[model samples]
Target chain A: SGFRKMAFPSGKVEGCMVQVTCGTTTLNGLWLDDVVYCPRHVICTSEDMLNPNYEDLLIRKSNHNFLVQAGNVQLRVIGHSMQNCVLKLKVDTANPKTPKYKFVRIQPGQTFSVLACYNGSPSGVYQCAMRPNFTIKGSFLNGSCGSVGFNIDYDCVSFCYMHHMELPTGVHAGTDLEGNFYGPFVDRQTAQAAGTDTTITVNVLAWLYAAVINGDRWFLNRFTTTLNDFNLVAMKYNYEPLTQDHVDILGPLSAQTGIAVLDMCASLKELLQNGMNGRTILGSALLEDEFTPFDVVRQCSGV
Target chain B: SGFRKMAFPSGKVEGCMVQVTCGTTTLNGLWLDDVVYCPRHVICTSEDMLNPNYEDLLIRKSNHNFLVQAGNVQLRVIGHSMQNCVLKLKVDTANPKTPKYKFVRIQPGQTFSVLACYNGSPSGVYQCAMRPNFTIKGSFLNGSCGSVGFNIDYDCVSFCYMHHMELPTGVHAGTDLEGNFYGPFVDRQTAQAAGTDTTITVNVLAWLYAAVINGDRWFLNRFTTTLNDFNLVAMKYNYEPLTQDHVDILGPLSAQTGIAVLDMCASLKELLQNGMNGRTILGSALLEDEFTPFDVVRQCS
Candidate 1:
C-alpha cells in the first residue's frame, strides 16, 4: 500500500531530482534489495505457493508414472519408399516382446513428391504443445534408484526490470568509431581501434544498456569493474528508460562532472592513445582490454 | 485379441458422436505430440486408450543387434603402434592380453594409413559384428560411454546403423575442387562445388520432401530424424539438422543447426536456400523462433 525510495539522483544538488515512490500505482525508480528498483516492481522474495509459477516449470525430473485419459490412438507408419527404397518400421507401444513391423512400398525416385512436403507437410516438424492439463506424468530414467539422480537460493534470487525506453545514443550516436555499424552492434573491433570518448561513452551505456534490457546480471557485471563510484552507484537502481532531456541533465558520470570518484573508471588509455584529448585521465583499464561489446559499451560519459 | 473406443467426434449428424473402432481401421486425424501425425490428424492422448482411439500408428526404440550369430571377429584399432613384433591377439573368449595383437607391422611413419589396429586412431572408429554371444567376447574400452568403446552391463548400447555409404569424389564434379561427397555431407565444404552442393542439398531435401509427402517416418528416421530430431516432437530446454517442420514453425533455426552433414545433404539445405514465402530472406515463417516475453505472458493469461 505504501513505500519509500531507496536511492536515485541526489536531485537536491542540481534541482532535477525525481523521487520514485513504491506502492499501488507509482512503481518507478527504486531498489528492492541493496539494489535500486523501479518502484512499481513487486518483491517476489519467496516461492511458497502451491499453485507454483507454472505448469511443471520446475519438473520433478525423475522417471515416474501417471495416467492419461485414454482414447482411441491408432497409427499408420509409412514405409512410403521416399528416396528410392522399400522401408519398414517396428512400431511398438505394447508388451516389449516380439514386435510388429509395417511395410510400405516406394516405387523408385520420389524426388518429385519429396519436393512437395517442404511445401508445408505438417508432420515434418519438431513441435509440441505444452498442454497444461491432460497430464502424461512421466519422467526420465530415475538412474539414482546407479542412475542416482537448493535453498538460500543467494544464488536463487534474480534482478528484473521493465524496459523504460531507449536512452539517447550519446555523442557520435549514429556511427561507431569505425565509422560503420554492424547490425544492432557498434562493430566492436573498429570502435576499439578509435578510443575516443565517444567509444567509451557509447559502449559503457551500450554494455550497461544491453544488460539492462536483457536483465542479464552477468553481462551487466562485466562493466561493474569499469565504472567509477558514481556510475557504479548509478548501476544500482532500476531507471525505467529515461528521455534525452533526462540523460542530458544528468550530464555524464565523470571526475570532471564534479560528483567525484575515480582512478579506475577513467579513460586512462583514451587520454593517451593517438587522437584522444590532451587531458590525461589516470590508469588504463579500459585501454588494455580490446574487442567486442566492451568497445561497444565502455563510455563513462565523463560527458 | 481386440480393443474398444470411448470418444470420437461426430461423423454423421453434421456434428455429433464420431465413430471409432480399434479392430477396423477408421482412420482418424491426430497429433503425435503435436504435429498432425495420424493420416487423419486428431489430437491424441494415451493414444486414446480408454475414451480414445487413433488411426494406424506405431513408433520404435529397441535392443536390436543382428550380428550375434557369427564368430571370430577381427577389429583393427588402427593405432599404428603395434608395439613392434607381431602385435597378435587371442580372439580371447574372456582372457585379458592372453594373446592380444595380430601379426601386423607399422612402418615408422604410417600416417599414410597406419593400418595398425585400435592402438589409437582419432575420428577413428573400431567395430566388428557382435557375432552374437561373442560381444568380440570383450572390448577395447567400450565407454563412447560417445567414449567410442564397448563393455558389459554399463551395457554401452549402440543405435548401430549400417552406413554402407557413398563416399565423395576428390573433386572434378564441376567448378569443384578435390573433395569427396559422402552421401551424408554433414558440412557443405567437403560435399561439392557450391553448385553441386546446392543441387545435392536440394535433391536430398527432395527425397525427404517426398518422404514427407508419403509420411515416411521410417525412411526419415533411418537417416535424419534420430540423428537430429527432425521428425520427432522434441524440445530444447536450453539447446540441431533441425527439422524443416521445426523451422517451418521456428524461424531461422536451421541457418546453422551445425550439422555439416545436413548442410551438405543438399535437400535439407532447401529450407536454408529458400525462405518461408520462398522470398529468399533468412528469417521468419508463419511462426518465429521466439515470442516476446509479454507475448508469452499475455498468451498464458
Candidate 2:
C-alpha cells in the first residue's frame, strides 16, 4: 500500500518539498512538482500563469503501499548494509489532538516511490520547511527511510543521500566574489548527518577528540585502521545531533582542552572520511621512543 | 687503743658467745684464750647457761674504748690471688651509736696482730662477728677492723671471719624435720642465709614447696637452665641484712619452673666458695642440669 491522502493544516504550502523512499531498501523516490492554483481561472490572467498554487489536491495511496513509476524518479540505497528491515513513516502535523499522518510499515527488501506538491497558488516566493519522518528498525541494518507530505505552492531546492563521503579536501586559493572560500563542496545530508545533532556521529567525534587529547597512538591506529565500518553505521544512522543534555555532557571536556565544539564536529567528519574505527579518543601525546621526543607528532591538528 | 666500756641495752650476755682470733705473727703474746674469759663461777654454771645476766661491769680501756688486750691475731693468706691484697677485719656491733671498730692496716704477704677484750666485766656469753674492710688509699694500704667486746665475767664460745677458702664438695643427708617436706639436707649456709626474719624464711620455704610440687625432669631442667650468674648474685645477697629495709627483690620467674630459693642459695654458696668465679660454676653440670628423679636416686641414694 502507499501513503494515505491528507488535508493540509494551512490552505497554502509555499516553501516545503516532499520526497518518499522505500522503507525496507532505503531507496529514494519521486519528487513532486511545484505549486499550482487551488481553483481554475475562468479567463486566463498573467498573474495566474506566473504564481499558481495547487492547494486542493490529495495523494491517492493506502497504508503500507508503494508507488511504482520507472522514469519518474530515481531510488538508491546509501549504505552497504540496509536490507530486510521494517521502515515506518509518520508526519508531524504540529497538532496534539489528531495526527496528520500515522506510521506505515514497509517490509524488508521492498521499493516505493513518492512526489511533492503544494496546497494552493501563491502570489509570492516560498521556502520549503518540511522534513521526513525516517525510521528504520532491525538488527544489523543501518540507514533510515521515511515519507514526507507537502502542499503544491512550495518551492523545493536540494536533496542528497551518500555513502562514505569525504570532508572538503582541496586547498583554498582565495575567496570568491561573495567572500566565500571554495574547495570541495559538501552536501546538506552529509553535513546534517555529521553535525552536532546526531548521537552516534557525536559519540564517534567525542571518541576521536579524546584520543587526540590523550595522545593514544594505539587507539588512533585501531581507529584509523577500521574507520570504514564505524562511519558506515555512524553516517547511516545520522547520529551527530547533539541535544541540550549531550552538549552539557561534552561541555566540560571541550572547555578543559579549549577545543571548539565545531572543531570536534569536523574532527569526527575527518575520522569518518578517513575510515577511523577505534571507539575511544585519549588526550595525550604519543611517544615513539622512551628516551627522546625524536618523533612526536600531534594527533589532532585543529583545536 | 681499746674498746670503750659499755653495757648492753638488755643488760645480759646469756645465750651469747664471743671468740677471738689472734693476729700476731708470734703466738707468745696475749692469745684468744688468755684475753677472753668468764666471771669467777660463770663458766661452769650450766643452770642458766642459755640466759646469763651481766648488770654491772666497767671494762673501759679508754674513754671510747670498750676492751683491751696485750697481743695480736694472725690470719694466713692462703690463696695466690689474695696474696697481694691487704686483709682487714670489721664487726657489726648491731648498735648504731657504737659502730664497729676502726680500720686496722695489715701488710700484704705478712701476719698482723691485735688485742681483744671487752670494756666491762659483764657476766654472759657472746659470739664474734668479723668482716673484711680492705681499702687502697694513695700508696698506703688500710685495714678497717672490729671486735666482739665482752666483759670479764662473760663467757666466749665460737668465732668466724671472712675466709678465702675453696668451695666444699660432697653431699649430706638433710632432713625435712619441719614437715614442709621441701628439702632433704640442703646446704647449711644456703638455708641459714635464706633470711634473717622468720617471715622471709617462711616465704622462701613456700616457694620451695611449690618447686617440689612440680618436681619433674622438665621442670627442673627449665628451673636450673635459667639461673645464670646474675641469679647467683641475688642468692649471695639473699637476706641483705646490711641494708635498712631488707626486702627480698628476686624473682618474676615462676617458682614452679625455676630454681627453688633454697637451691639458688646453695648454688650461690658453691660459687662463693670457688672464689666468686661465676664462669666456672655456670659451666658446672649441677647448675646446668636440673635434678631429675634418676639423678636423685643415683646421687643422693
Candidate 3:
C-alpha cells in the first residue's frame, strides 16, 4: 500500500525579511510541499530543490502554512540535563489596535517534529517559543523562568522589522554641532536652551536620532533652524551692546546661519535710540519710518 | 585740455578669447576711449571704477571702450613665483573671450584691486591665463607662461549641447563559473585550454596598458585574441586540452570582431588532419588539434 497523502494550508504571511531554522534534530529531508490544494490540486515543487543533510537546514517559514510531508522527523536535543522551560511565540501582524499574537506555556527542550497528521488548519505565522519553567525559591511566583521563541518565517521579516524600525525609538542620545550630547527634551524651550552652549553637539545628535528613527531628514533642517534662532535670541539677552561676548556670539551666529544678526541688532538699537517703543518696534512703525535718521544712517554715521 | 587720449598700436592682438596686460605699474585707472584704438591713443585716468582701494585698472577694447564699473572686475595672478607671475584683470565686456584688458606685471604679494568707473554692460563669462617666464629648473620655455583667455558671443549656447551617445571601450576582468579569474584570450582554443587549469590567469596587464595609453579597447581585444590563440596553439605541443580557456579567448574575439576562433581552429585542424599522406602530426598541428578534440580524432585516425 502506498503512503496516504495529506493536504497543508496555504496563505501569504506579511512581514519584513526573516531567517528560518529547523527546531528539531532528526528533521532531515523534510520537504515543505507547496501545492495547489484548494479547489484544484497540483503538488507544487520547488524549482531549486534542496536535499539538506540533517545539519544545514535553515529554511525560514512565512506566516503561511505549507503541506509538510510526514517523515521520520526528530527533535534536536542539546545538553544532558534538561530543565522544564516554557516556549512562547509572539507575532505582530502590523494591525494597529490588534497587532500582537502570543502563544505561551510552551515547554523548553521539547521539539515539535511531526507534521499535522489530520486535515487541520494551521496558523500561518507560527513561531516556537520556549521558557524555562523552573522554581528557585519554591514559590510559584518566585520561579526563575526565561523564554525563547523562534519564528517560523524563514526571512525573519518580523524580527528584522522590529529591530531595524521599531526597537530604538527614544533610546538614542541627541548631539549638537560640537558633537556634545544633549539630553532628551520634551519641549522646544529645552531644545532651544541647549542650542546656546552646544549648537553642533545637540543638533547633530537630534539629526542622527531623527535619521535613524524616521529614516528621513524632513524635521532635521527645521530643528537646526529653531536651535539657531533660539541661540541668537539668547545671545542678545546674555551680553551687553558692542561687548566682546556679544560680538563673539553674534559673529559666529551670522556666519553659521548666513543671516546678519548683528546688522539686525544694530538696526533695532538705532530704532530704540530714536524713541521707538518696544511696541513700535514689534509693530510696523519701525518699518514705516522710511525717513528716520536711524533708518538712513550707516553704522559708522559717516563715510 | 580734456586729457588728450594717447594713441598706441591698435591691433596688438586678435582672437576669440584674448587678454591684454599693461606693462607699466605707473598707470592706476585706464579707460578705453574707443572700441578699436592704437596703444598710444589709450588714456589713463585717475578715477577708480571696479575696485575702490588699489590702483590697478582693466579695459576691454572690443566694442565701445568705456570705464569698467565697480563690482564688475576681477584681477587674478597665476604662476608659481609671484615675481614671475603675470597679472590678469578680467572685466565685464558683455563678451566671454575678451572680458577685460590688463595694465601691469603684477608684483608678488602685492594687493591688486579693480575700480569700477562706469556701469552699462552686464556680467559675462571670461577668464585669463598666466604663465611664469622660467620653469622650476630655470628652463626658459613657453610652458612657464600662463594664459588668460575668455569666451565671447555670450548666449549660454554651449551648455545646450550636453548629451551625447558613445560606447565605452577598455580592458576589464570577467569571472568564470567558480568566480575565478579566467582567460583573456582572443580566440576560442586559448580560452578553452586556459579554463582547464585549476585557475586560469590571463596577464591582462599588457592589454590594459595598451588600451589606457592608446584609448582603444577594440584593437586591444583583437590583439589579445591573436596572441592568446598563438599561445594556445604553441601549448598544444604539451598536450593540454582546450577548455574554458580557449573558449574565453575565442569567445571575446568573436564578440568583439565577429571572428570565431573556434570555427577557424576547427577548420585549420580539419584541413591539416585530413590533408593526407595520412598520419604524422606537426608539433604545431598537434597543438592546434589539442584544442579541437573532434578534429584531432578525425585527423589522426
For candidate 1, write residues B150-269 as lDDT tens digits: 111111121111111112321111000111121322211233321222111122332333223222222222234343443222222111224454334322222323323343333332
Q: Which residue runs does candidate 2 get wrong by more than 4 Å?
A: A1-199, A217-237, A277-303, B1-301
Instruction: Please give the clash total of every predicted structure, in order.
Output: 94, 88, 108
Instruction: Give candidate 3's error at residue A1 in angstroms.
Output: 99
DockQ computed for model 1 against the true two-chain complex using alpha carbons? 0.01
After the best TM-score superposition of candidate 2, give how far the Cα of residue A153 lies from its true spot, in angstroms.
Answer: 54
Residue A100 miss distance in model 1 (angstroms): 25
lDDT of 2 by residue, A113-195 (tens): 12112111111111111112121111010111121222221222122111111222111011111112122332122332211
Put down candidate 2 lDDT per residue, B1-301, tens digits, no spaces: 0010111211112112233222221111112211222221111123433332322112211122212222232222121110111111122222122212222222111111111212221111111111111111010001101222221211222221111111121111111111111112122223321112111222232233333332322222222323344344544544322111111323322233455444544443443344322222211212211222221221111
Question: Candidate 3 residues B1-301, lDDT tens each?
Answer: 0000011111111112122223321111222222211111112222432222222222332222323232335323221111111122333343333324433332111111111011111111111111011001110111111111111111211100000011111111111111122123221111222222211112112122212222222222222234446446535533233445545644543444343554444333333234322221221111111112211111112
User: How much lDDT does each candidate structure score?
Assistant: 0.19, 0.24, 0.21
Q: Report the C-alpha displacement of residue A20, candidate 3, in angstroms.
A: 36
Interface RMSD of each: 31.9, 64.8, 48.3
User: What is candidate 2's TM-score for chain B alone?
Assistant: 0.18
- Candidate 3: Cα lDDT at A294: 16
Instruction: By lDDT, rank the candidates, best first.
Output: 2, 3, 1
Which ranges of candidate 3 are over 4 A from the true structure?
A: A1-246, A249-266, A269-303, B1-20, B23-43, B47-301
